[PDB]
From a paper:
We prepared the Rsu1/PINCH1 complex by combinatorial usage of the purified fragments that contains the elements necessary and sufficient for the Rsu1/PINCH1 interaction and successfully obtained the crystals of the Rsu1ΔC/PINCH1_LIM5C and Rsu1/PINCH1_LIM45C complexes. The complex structures of Rsu1ΔC/PINCH1_LIM5C with one crystal form at 1.65 Å resolution and Rsu1/PINCH1_LIM45C with two different crystal forms at 2.2 Å and 3.15 Å resolution respectively were determined by the molecular replacement method. The N-cap consists of the α1-helix while the C-cap contains three α-helices (α2–4). Both the two helical regions cap the LRR-solenoid by forming extensive hydrophobic interactions with LRR1–2 and LRR8–9, respectively. All the nine LRRs adopt the typical LRR-folding by using conserved leucine residues to form the hydrophobic core except for a few short loops inserted in LRR1, 5, and 9. Consistent with our biochemical finding, the LRR-solenoid of Rsu1 interacts with both the LIM5 domain and the C-terminal tail (C-tail, folded as a α-helix) of PINCH1 through the concave surface of the solenoid, mainly formed by the parallel β-sheet and the flanking loop regions. However, the LIM4 domain in PINCH1 adopts different orientations as observed in the two crystal forms of the Rsu1/PINCH1_LIM45C complex, indicating the intrinsic, structural flexibility between the LIM4 and LIM5 domains. Interestingly, although separately distributed at the interface, the polar interactions are well organized together by forming a hydrogen-bond network.
Ras suppressor protein 1 (Rsu1), a leucine-rich repeat (LRR)-containing protein conserved from human to worms, was recognized as a major FA component and is important for FA formation and cell motility. Among the IAC components, tripartite integrin-linked kinase (ILK) associates with another two key players PINCH and Parvin to form the ILK/PINCH/Parvin (IPP) complex, which acts as an essential platform to recruit many proteins for the FA formation and signaling and provide a linkage between FA and actin cytoskeleton. Here, we solved the crystal structures of the Rsu1/PINCH1 complex and found that Rsu1 strongly binds to PINCH1 through a large concave surface on its LRR solenoid. The cellular data supported the inhibitory effect of Rsu1 on the IPP complex. These results indicated that Rsu1, by interacting with PINCH1 and preventing PINCH1 from binding to actin, modulates actin dynamics at the FA and thereby regulates the stress fiber formation and cell adhesion dynamics.
Numbering used by the authors:
A (entry chain B): 189 to 318
B (entry chain A): 5 to 251
């Protein structure tokens, strides 16, 4: 027989939305955050739920460790964290960095080579053994 | 130094970098405290022993970095910075923080690594800093972490590496946002079961706990992996043994 909607469990006689392994009425297939129907617009999926682009990025987009905002544009990934390209910088002198720089990991923060050299010897000796 | 101040006011540069310039006194930096427009000030790797109350005049500061000086105390005015989000006091000589330090309304990252702080160093209102998402207390002298640590509900990162902790407060279990817990190099023997309310087994998460005199079953579970550790401290067996270990 004809498809049945996944949200209201009723037969779909007219136009059918095919998404996430289910069939939907156009009005009943909506974003999980805001209750707004996609109406043809691209949807984004996450854990069996559909979201609009703006709310998808807000809930699941990478957040910058420095400016604490959802990153727009390219992401710098390092040390289990993420930075905006223009935010990535040394944690001890704030000089901007790229992944092409030789920085060290210090309590899971990036520290530039020049800064690390200035650390106390007793600390550097302990960090090597760790 | 008189050219990094003049050019910052002429071209309206919000970021001032005076790292490693042999500065022994901020009041000696000509015109520094007239730059009310700046949002970032870096004074790391200098020779500062103090911070003057004039710091309050830089009212738009969002980033303030004093890493690796010899600062021994801070003025109360440090907490009047309404826009301050990042404060690096790492590698100094602090054994106290000033009255009302916890009044900073927007502070997100606080770095106190490598000083001489203990629980007694913290002002009564320290844990009013509820906007904090990262707190670094590595290389200090904490024996006890106050239970009010639980008031810091947005905390994602907590480092207590290389302190003198004999115990972890169960209130750490209330930190539902926590992603990183660094507790290497203390004097911990057991973990509170309430820590199991947290899950730090994720790929993006960190749980570092080496170099503690853990009781044998906990040390054994570490050798198997973080998943095993958290499974264990959630178990009825651990709860039974923990209750008897305390009494
Ligand atoms: Zn329907
Ligand atoms: Zn939406
Ligand atoms: Zn950013
Ligand atoms: Zn650096």
């Amino acid at each position: 027989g004809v498809p049945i909607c996944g949200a209201c469990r009723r037969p779909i006689e007219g136009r059918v939305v095919n998404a996430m392994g289910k069939q939907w009425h156009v009005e009943h297939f909506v974003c999980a955050k805001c209750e707004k129907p996609f109406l043809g617009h691209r949807h984004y999926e996450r854990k069996g739920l559909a979201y609009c682009e703006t709310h998808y990025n807000q809930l699941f987009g990478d957040v910058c460790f420095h400016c604490n905002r959802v990153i727009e544009g390219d992401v710098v990934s390092a040390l289990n964290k993420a930075w905006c390209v223009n935010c990535f910088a040394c944690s001890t002198c704030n000089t901007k960095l790229t992944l092409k720089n030789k920085f060290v990991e210090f309590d899971m923060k990036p520290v530039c080579k020049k800064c690390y050299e200035k650390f106390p010897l007793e600390l550097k000796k302990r960090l090597k053994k760790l | 130094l008189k050219k990094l101040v003049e050019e910052s006011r002429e071209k309206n540069q919000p970021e001032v970098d005076m790292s490693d310039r042999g500065i022994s006194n901020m009041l000696d930096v000509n015109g520094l405290f007239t730059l009310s427009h700046i949002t970032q000030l870096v004074l790391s790797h200098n020779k500062l022993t103090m911070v003057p109350p004039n710091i309050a005049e830089l009212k738009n500061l969002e980033v303030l970095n004093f890493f690796n000086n010899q600062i021994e105390e801070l003025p109360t005015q440090i907490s009047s910075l309404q826009k301050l989000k990042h404060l690096n006091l790492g590698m100094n000589r602090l054994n106290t923080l000033p009255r009302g330090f916890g009044s900073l309304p927007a502070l997100e990252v606080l770095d106190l690594t490598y000083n001489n702080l203990s629980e007694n160093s913290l002002p009564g209102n320290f844990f009013y800093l509820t906007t904090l998402r990262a707190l670094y207390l590595s290389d200090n002298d904490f024996e006890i972490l106050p239970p009010d640590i639980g008031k810091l509900t947005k905390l994602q990162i907590l480092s207590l590496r290389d302190n003198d902790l004999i115990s972890l407060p169960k209130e750490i279990g209330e930190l539902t946002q926590l992603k990183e817990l660094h507790i290497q190099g203390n004097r911990l023997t057991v973990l509170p079961p309430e820590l199991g309310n947290l899950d730090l087994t994720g790929q993006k998460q960190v749980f570092k706990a080496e170099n503690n005199p853990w009781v044998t079953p906990i040390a054994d579970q570490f050798q198997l992996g973080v998943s095993h550790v958290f499974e264990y401290i959630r178990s009825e067996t651990y709860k039974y043994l923990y209750g008897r270990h305390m009494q």
